[PDB]
Ligand binder design. Structure first.
Ligand SMILES: O=c1ccn([C@H]2C[C@H](O)[C@@H](COP(=O)(O)O)O2)c(=O)[nH]1
Ligand SMILES: O=c1ccn([C@H]2C[C@H](O)[C@@H](COP(=O)(O)O)O2)c(=O)[nH]1
Ligand SMILES: O=c1ccn([C@H]2C[C@H](O)[C@@H](COP(=O)(O)O)O2)c(=O)[nH]1
Lengths: 113, 113, 113
């Protein structure tokens, strides 16, 4: 894109997630397996947070599975949605809100690096 | 139901999750795809938190997949468990603990709404 | 093993997750359904935190699904990765980093126990 995370919108003040759409029209089938969908949105994330990509319920019920994805605080690449058609052919129109990004606190530990 | 989240119980003081059961007896097969299971439990959530629905390991190993679900802080509807039979026929008895609700902090950002 | 969580490493300072490998060579197929992979790493977790097991994207794209798993703060058993081959035969070499553990804050509520 390259657009940053600050450009994403949350649907309501109580909404935990920032909505993510695919930039492309994509058709998915079960036998295709996991596919990485492009968003045109780029890390990195606010200080001391990491990101979690999760599906929206509406889209899940429609047979599109979003695999939970961890976004590191310092990742500066494109944020892609890992998705699979569950049972049937799923068609993703450009600009449909497929997933959501949740920001979570990044806990410090003494683990080696 | 309508019952609130305060009515849920956690199995041990160290348990991260509040246990969720289905109110109905339900049979699930792989070709059915994602099904929304009723809990009779309703949002909303404590201030400055959001909720995450996740599966229990025992139930996962038994072939019932729970799709991660985000519950918004201000959602006042019924909390439903999005589930799928993975490989085989899964039978869910009324009152079996199928999923768990985790409460997480809702981080404030300057994202447009 | 028994090794504690403090022995795990994080790949970069910005990495949210602690990397998890299987201790065994394992072959997985779709018809096998969910399998619990041994890590040789044991709870419990730092005070006031709980753990979440999630997949790595690279491994997900390769057709290995990791089911999100909650680790309770006071769990003192072995941390196992719940996994399934999605579409094809997946082979897991001993010592490949399959999953990651994320630490999250454990919120106190007045829920009965
Ligand atoms: O597993 C789930 C996921 C979502 N919801 C409810 C709570 C959410 O705030 C609301 C809207 O979800 P989305 O379609 O925007 O994901 O649906 C559930 O009951 N269970
Ligand atoms: O992916 C997982 C999920 C759970 N557990 C362990 C830690 C939990 O505290 C314990 C009990 O899990 P449940 O059956 O209640 O989900 O199992 C794992 O090792 N890996
Ligand atoms: O759904 C996902 C999961 C991961 N990533 C990006 C951000 C991560 O920091 C980076 C590396 O992920 P891993 O392979 O280590 O999981 O990939 C995504 O864009 N989408």
């Amino acid at each position: 894109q390259k657009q940053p995370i600050s450009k994403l919108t949350r649907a309501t003040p109580g909404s935990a997630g920032l909505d993510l759409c695919s930039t492309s029209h994509t058709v998915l089938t079960p036998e295709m397996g996991p596919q990485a969908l492009s968003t045109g949105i780029y890390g990195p994330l606010p200080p001391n947070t990491f990101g979690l990509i999760l599906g929206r319920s509406s889209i899940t019920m429609k047979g599109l599975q979003v695999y939970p994805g961890v976004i590191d605080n310092d990742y500066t690449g494109e944020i892609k949605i890992m998705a699979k058609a569950v049972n049937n052919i799923v068609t993703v129109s450009q600009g449909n809100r497929i997933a959501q990004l949740i920001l979570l606190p990044l806990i410090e530990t003494d683990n080696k690096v």
